[PDB]
Design an enzyme around this catalytic site. Sequence first.
Site, PDB file in Angstrom:
ATOM      1  N   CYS A  75      60.272  -7.334  -5.788  1.00  0.00           N
ATOM      2  CA  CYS A  75      60.804  -8.275  -4.968  1.00  0.00           C
ATOM      3  C   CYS A  75      59.894  -9.516  -4.733  1.00  0.00           C
ATOM      4  O   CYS A  75      58.729  -9.158  -4.843  1.00  0.00           O
ATOM      5  CB  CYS A  75      61.048  -7.861  -3.334  1.00  0.00           C
ATOM      6  SG  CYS A  75      62.003  -6.368  -3.391  1.00  0.00           S
ATOM      7  N   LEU A  79      59.459 -13.652  -2.779  1.00  0.00           N
ATOM      8  CA  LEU A  79      59.901 -14.134  -1.581  1.00  0.00           C
ATOM      9  C   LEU A  79      58.746 -15.137  -1.269  1.00  0.00           C
ATOM     10  O   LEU A  79      57.624 -15.064  -1.483  1.00  0.00           O
ATOM     11  CB  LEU A  79      59.991 -13.385  -0.206  1.00  0.00           C
ATOM     12  CG  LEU A  79      60.227 -14.186   0.986  1.00  0.00           C
ATOM     13  CD1 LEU A  79      61.443 -14.762   0.909  1.00  0.00           C
ATOM     14  CD2 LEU A  79      60.162 -13.061   2.106  1.00  0.00           C
ATOM     15  N   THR A  80      59.177 -16.433  -1.091  1.00  0.00           N
ATOM     16  CA  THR A  80      58.451 -17.381  -0.494  1.00  0.00           C
ATOM     17  C   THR A  80      58.997 -17.592   1.104  1.00  0.00           C
ATOM     18  O   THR A  80      60.049 -17.773   1.419  1.00  0.00           O
ATOM     19  CB  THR A  80      58.733 -18.733  -1.219  1.00  0.00           C
ATOM     20  OG1 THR A  80      58.137 -18.815  -2.573  1.00  0.00           O
ATOM     21  CG2 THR A  80      57.893 -19.971  -0.486  1.00  0.00           C
ATOM     22  N   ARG A 117      60.278 -25.325  -0.509  1.00  0.00           N
ATOM     23  CA  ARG A 117      60.482 -26.665  -0.900  1.00  0.00           C
ATOM     24  C   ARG A 117      59.139 -27.428  -1.210  1.00  0.00           C
ATOM     25  O   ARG A 117      59.023 -28.556  -0.976  1.00  0.00           O
ATOM     26  CB  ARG A 117      61.391 -27.476  -0.180  1.00  0.00           C
ATOM     27  CG  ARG A 117      62.660 -27.008   0.026  1.00  0.00           C
ATOM     28  CD  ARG A 117      63.742 -27.963   0.825  1.00  0.00           C
ATOM     29  NE  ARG A 117      64.984 -27.586   1.213  1.00  0.00           N
ATOM     30  CZ  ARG A 117      66.028 -28.149  -0.119  1.00  0.00           C
ATOM     31  NH1 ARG A 117      65.230 -28.695  -1.214  1.00  0.00           N
ATOM     32  NH2 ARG A 117      67.273 -27.761   0.116  1.00  0.00           N
ATOM     33  N   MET A 118      58.304 -26.642  -1.769  1.00  0.00           N
ATOM     34  CA  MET A 118      56.887 -27.150  -1.989  1.00  0.00           C
ATOM     35  C   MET A 118      56.304 -26.730  -3.358  1.00  0.00           C
ATOM     36  O   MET A 118      55.125 -26.604  -3.609  1.00  0.00           O
ATOM     37  CB  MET A 118      55.952 -26.652  -0.858  1.00  0.00           C
ATOM     38  CG  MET A 118      56.124 -27.299   0.548  1.00  0.00           C
ATOM     39  SD  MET A 118      55.201 -26.717   2.074  1.00  0.00           S
ATOM     40  CE  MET A 118      53.529 -27.378   1.441  1.00  0.00           C
ATOM     41  N   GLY A 119      57.176 -26.019  -4.100  1.00  0.00           N
ATOM     42  CA  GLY A 119      56.861 -25.420  -5.351  1.00  0.00           C
ATOM     43  C   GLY A 119      56.180 -24.183  -5.553  1.00  0.00           C
ATOM     44  O   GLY A 119      55.658 -23.749  -6.616  1.00  0.00           O
ATOM     45  N   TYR A 120      56.098 -23.354  -4.517  1.00  0.00           N
ATOM     46  CA  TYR A 120      55.525 -22.144  -4.320  1.00  0.00           C
ATOM     47  C   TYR A 120      55.982 -21.275  -5.195  1.00  0.00           C
ATOM     48  O   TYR A 120      55.538 -20.394  -5.823  1.00  0.00           O
ATOM     49  CB  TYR A 120      55.083 -21.779  -2.950  1.00  0.00           C
ATOM     50  CG  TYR A 120      54.401 -22.626  -1.817  1.00  0.00           C
ATOM     51  CD1 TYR A 120      53.125 -22.937  -2.487  1.00  0.00           C
ATOM     52  CD2 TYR A 120      54.701 -23.375  -0.884  1.00  0.00           C
ATOM     53  CE1 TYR A 120      52.179 -23.616  -1.872  1.00  0.00           C
ATOM     54  CE2 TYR A 120      53.906 -24.084  -0.526  1.00  0.00           C
ATOM     55  CZ  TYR A 120      52.667 -24.366  -0.541  1.00  0.00           C
ATOM     56  OH  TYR A 120      51.868 -25.146   0.132  1.00  0.00           O
ATOM     57  N   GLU A 174      63.219  -7.670 -11.340  1.00  0.00           N
ATOM     58  CA  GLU A 174      64.180  -6.457 -10.700  1.00  0.00           C
ATOM     59  C   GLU A 174      65.307  -7.074 -10.641  1.00  0.00           C
ATOM     60  O   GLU A 174      65.794  -8.089 -10.227  1.00  0.00           O
ATOM     61  CB  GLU A 174      63.600  -5.693  -9.544  1.00  0.00           C
ATOM     62  CG  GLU A 174      64.343  -4.436  -9.347  1.00  0.00           C
ATOM     63  CD  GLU A 174      63.646  -3.473  -8.594  1.00  0.00           C
ATOM     64  OE1 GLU A 174      62.320  -2.979  -8.870  1.00  0.00           O
ATOM     65  OE2 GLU A 174      64.144  -3.201  -7.433  1.00  0.00           O
ATOM     66  N   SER A 229      68.036 -12.654  -5.384  1.00  0.00           N
ATOM     67  CA  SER A 229      69.004 -13.491  -4.438  1.00  0.00           C
ATOM     68  C   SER A 229      69.313 -15.021  -5.124  1.00  0.00           C
ATOM     69  O   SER A 229      68.788 -15.356  -6.232  1.00  0.00           O
ATOM     70  CB  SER A 229      67.816 -14.006  -3.299  1.00  0.00           C
ATOM     71  OG  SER A 229      66.669 -14.463  -3.484  1.00  0.00           O
TER      72      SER A 229
END
EC number: 2.3.1.48
Lengths: 75, 297, 293, 120
Positions: free
Chosen positions: C152, C154-155, C161-164, C186, C190
């Site tokens: 999984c 996730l940011t 919206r900061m390029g992470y 995997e 999303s």
Amino acid sequence: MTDELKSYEALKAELKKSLQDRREQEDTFDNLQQEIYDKETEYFSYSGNIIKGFDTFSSAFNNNDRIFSLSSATY
Amino acid sequence: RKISVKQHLKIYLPNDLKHDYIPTPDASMTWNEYDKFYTGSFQETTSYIKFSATVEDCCGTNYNMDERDETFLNEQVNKGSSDILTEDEFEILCSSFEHAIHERQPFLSMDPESILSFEELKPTLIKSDFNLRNQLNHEINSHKTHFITQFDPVSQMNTRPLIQLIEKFGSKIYDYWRERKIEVNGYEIFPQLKFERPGEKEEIDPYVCFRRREVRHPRKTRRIDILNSQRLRALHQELKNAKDLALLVAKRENVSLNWINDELKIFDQRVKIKNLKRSLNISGEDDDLINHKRKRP
Amino acid sequence: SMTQNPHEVARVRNLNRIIMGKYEIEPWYFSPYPIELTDEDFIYIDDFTLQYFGSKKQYERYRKKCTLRHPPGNEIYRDDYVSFFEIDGRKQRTWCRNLCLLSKLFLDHKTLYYDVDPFLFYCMTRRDELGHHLVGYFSKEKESADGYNVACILTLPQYQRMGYGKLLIEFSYELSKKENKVGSPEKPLSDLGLLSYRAYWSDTLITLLVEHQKEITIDEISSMTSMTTTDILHTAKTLNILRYYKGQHIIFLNEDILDRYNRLKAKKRRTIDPNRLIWKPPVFTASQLRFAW
Amino acid sequence: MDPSLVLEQTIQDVSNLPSEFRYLLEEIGSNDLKLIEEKKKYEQKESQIHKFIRQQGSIPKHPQEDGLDKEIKESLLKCQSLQREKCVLANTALFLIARHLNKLEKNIALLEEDGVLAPV
């Protein structure tokens, strides 16, 4: 004004003692680092250490690996 | 095009869209009290962090006062008392109460009304890693104040030890804590995670988390595991040599701290003597006011 | 403790609003936080230990006592922008659980059925005067047989919206390249993640194909990027790189593609610097690849 | 109770400890360089007062005695702060290995209360 003279007699004795304490600390410090150096030699020269790692159940001890002695700038 | 009206609806975006369409979290507002809760500094080190302590190691006391604990401390225990009870100290007592009942009355919820009395509990509160922290303080030969690590905030130093907090405030606090345990029928006072009981299997309850279904069975033999006991003994030795050197280094820095605490005191004594020597016009007396030269390898 | 109420009412409720650190977030999906918390106005999430709170007073008392200021693990990557910490779910049980409870609020297909033992958690942080601030993570099966280099990903919503997300993916493939293994996220991703992965795939492919000059093969692309041949061929089909013109297979880098290539080269996107990755892949024995006992 | 289970558990619990000891000790040595350089910064200024006393005594005041004393006291307490940090670092390294040693020793005690653990 004799109290001011007794303060001088008290501070001198307190400075007699702190100087003696300082020398004892200086003296025990010198022993410890030698003890630290000697224990590095007795223990690191199954074969797991803090130097190499513990999970051996699947290169030599250079003086660059004496991480305990190398933590004192005096050595 | 523009200004063709056949039901043109406008949407404002408390739920955003990004360009299937993709929903997007909206920008997050800031929290006003942030600067009050997050106070301190973390110095970056030259080399990359090496760390293996757990959250439990870095949290201090288990218990955390809630709003109701706060009002009871101020408006009852510390209302007009000559001796005030610190919040950190209040949690130290409750943390010991919870641990004691968890050990002596593990099935309290079977009969919550029959929870132990304070006098019945006091013996067990006395017997209650404080011991290891004190053992290390003696081995270092520090023998002063508390043993300080990276896992200790400086605010916990001004807190009284447990054994005396029992005598001063124990009976008053426990009677309040006791009523909380009674209200929750012997169960946990504060919200807990919902776990699956060992050997049982639950599938319907949505709140059951982090199941552990693995099981290890003993070998079908009574013989002694000679192999894995020699290597356990070997590892136990290397951890003992490990501790010997780490103790020495902690001894070395402790005397290095005493030495400089002496220098800072010797200095403050030499300047007071001199300011005192000039007021009384006493001459000579300069042997201990200057450093001499002795032998050091 | 086996101390659980059997007559406790179990009702599924999303959290009203969480306050993780300094930012106020709204959860999208259900996460099995304690039932008592599920009916509270505000939920407080410590920004270092990820501990959950319903009482602001306890959150205050916790912060005054909590000495941790970064993910409980080794720092394995640091530039002046972000840092990466590697955390074992079997060693940092409480923390990784708190992360998974937090992550589940914003991941729909993340599962909390079993404990966190089988996972490695690679967490991206932003250092501050207060300490390292978690902004996003990706989990990874300890020894994935399916070749999944991300379980999984996730940011955290307040750092969107900061390029992470593009840094997370890039770091995940950076680990795969150091591991000398090919990998793929995997399968259920999303909508937001599938977009971010297609961007990374198309960007790194056009950059590789242009600068390659020499004739390349699908297997060699996989060796250089640790992308699977399946992801490579799909990205070549998302672009029109792959043409069959006059009895043979060819790679076509048209002008519209080279425009995006040049826009990429002029842009100052944040990237992962492989030389600042001080990290050897974890070695697990047969007994370590089990749940703790 | 299984020696192979305690061994597996103890191995994992101390796996990152050798890496931690290096990180801590090299942070001590980095502060001992900072400590030594700050020692020169007052051992020199301490030498100014003592040279004046060696020739004239304590009753005469050094030309800048009040000025150097403030610079000595300032440089000494900075050394105190630097030394305390070395103690904190050295104590955690001791605390880490001591705590793992105590846990292992409790397991060895329990293994011996059953028949499962062989003698030395």
